[PDB]
């Protein structure tokens, strides 16, 4: 009757991975070939899915009464604080590369380094989301500093208040309906977070006399770091690195939006008679339990238990094999989002089966409802 860990020594690979574009660069300059900038894009899409399948499932689920034990070893949180700084290095160093060697690089390599640093910005946000749902002060300010390096400092207010109030609900801009491409979704999504956060802090402060443009606003507080960062880095390295700083940013935002897509895709909460909505449940969130993908993204593939208890560090999060189950880990499902028709070849049927085959529990894209119900025989 023991919880001997399994992955314990191997959580420091998370200090490693954020430096993959940099040693990609070094290697690509010493050996003298060209593809070696496109190295994160291969690690993430082709060696981690293979390796995923090569290892297997995880054999570690914490039981119930060990949570108050697993939330008292500080190693699991020092490994997130240390990750916050490395991220600025990767950005600054890479940009100084392109400008210190514009005159020996092609344009392939520029696009490539930009994409690599974009994926690593996904890991900044997955280190900001894990350090926001905390109840200390240190963790919160660190969340904002780390999020500032991609310009997504309002994720704070947005994710917590909104997403955690109305996940799986017609009026949450992140819950994706069933029958909608990630393209039209990204449209309806990216402005959603911004508009909503702005209104939200406005109406909070308004109860008071401390005018909208204040200091304590947490949506315009990390712009004080993203504005100087870019103005400096750019006007120092010269205007030459503008075609590479935009690519990195857009790919970061794409990373975040694809996740939200495949997390709560198609799932809906039932309506209480003549009242409000029903509180979140376990069977409204997709999750997986493969090993190395979890090791990279601190267990995030276990989303249901996350919504089950927001405040719980990434070492007590349980696993469940009878709630909804994805087919694979996160990289392949990413690779399937971008191409919608096959996405519909697969996760359509899964969603119909696990949710219950009927139109009072699934959330159908409110632009084509009549088709979506007429075909795929459903019930109303």
């Amino acid at each position, epitope marked *: *009757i023991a919880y*001997r860990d399994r992955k314990r020594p191997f959580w420091t690979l998370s200090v490693l991975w954020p430096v993959s574009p940099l040693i990609g660069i070094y290697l690509a300059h010493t050996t003298g070939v060209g593809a070696f900038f496109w190295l994160t894009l291969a690690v993430w899409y082709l060696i981690i899915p293979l390796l995923d399948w090569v290892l297997g499932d995880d054999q570690s689920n914490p039981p119930e009464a060990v949570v108050p*034990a697993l939330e008292s070893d500080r190693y699991y949180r020092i490994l997130t604080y240390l990750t916050v700084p490395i991220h600025y290095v990767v950005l600054i160093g890479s940009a100084w590369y392109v400008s210190t060697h514009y005159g020996s690089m092609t344009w392939y390599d520029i696009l490539g380094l930009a994409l690599s640093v974009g994926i690593v910005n996904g890991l900044a946000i997955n280190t900001g989301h894990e350090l926001g749902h905390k109840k200390t002060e240190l963790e919160r300010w660190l969340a904002k500093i780390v999020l500032a390096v991609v310009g997504y400092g309002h994720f704070f207010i947005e994710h917590n208040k909104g997403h955690h109030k109305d996940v799986a609900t017609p009026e949450d801009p992140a819950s994706a309906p069933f029958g909608q491409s990630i393209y039209r979704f990204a449209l309806r999504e990216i402005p959603g977070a911004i508009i909503r956060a702005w209104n939200s802090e406005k109406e909070r402060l308004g109860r008071l006399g401390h005018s909208p443009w204040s200091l304590q606003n947490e949506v315009l507080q990390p712009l004080l770091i993203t504005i100087p960062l870019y103005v400096g880095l750019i006007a120092v390295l010269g205007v030459k690195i503008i075609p590479f700083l935009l690519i990195q940013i857009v790919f970061g935002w794409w990373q975040l939006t694809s996740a939200n897509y495949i997390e709560h895709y198609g799932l809906l909460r039932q309506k209480l008679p003549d009242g409000r909505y029903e509180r979140c449940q376990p069977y409204h969130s997709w999750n997986s339990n493969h090993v190395m993908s979890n090791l990279i993204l601190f267990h995030l593939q276990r989303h249901s238990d996350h919504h089950a208890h927001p405040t719980r560090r990434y070492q007590s999060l349980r696993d469940f094999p009878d709630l909804p189950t994805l087919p694979s880990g996160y990289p392949l499902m990413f690779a399937l989002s971008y191409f919608p028709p096959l996405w519909r070849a697969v996760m359509d049927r899964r969603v119909l089966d696990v949710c219950g085959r009927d139109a009072r529990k699934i959330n159908i894209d409110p632009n084509q409802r009549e088709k979506i119900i007429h075909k795929f025989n459903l019930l109303t």
Partner: nanobody
Amino acid sequence: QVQLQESGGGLVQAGGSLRLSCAASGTISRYWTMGWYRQAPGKERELVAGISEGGSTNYADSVKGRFTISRDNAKNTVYLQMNSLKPEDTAVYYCAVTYRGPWFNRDPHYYWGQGTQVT
């Protein structure tokens, strides 16, 4: 083998004292900290007591001043003589123990058991 037997349950008056104890066995190691964890109804298990090889208390601030946890007996032995009973704290108690390896290793081995539902 490795398990954690205990004693010390019952019902007493609110304003009395009681003593918890659980004695494990079969230890091939010598670095750890043995502690109590209580489960208030509707409450996720919070920490109550646990003492390290050297001896350094970490209670939860709500029990500070009434509960004490000590050893000084044959190996794999720990005590908690509780006092000043309230009906607001009445729960089930696991007696929990841990382990340790060279800092480099630091493979934490956790072991659990429960019983002695207080009042």
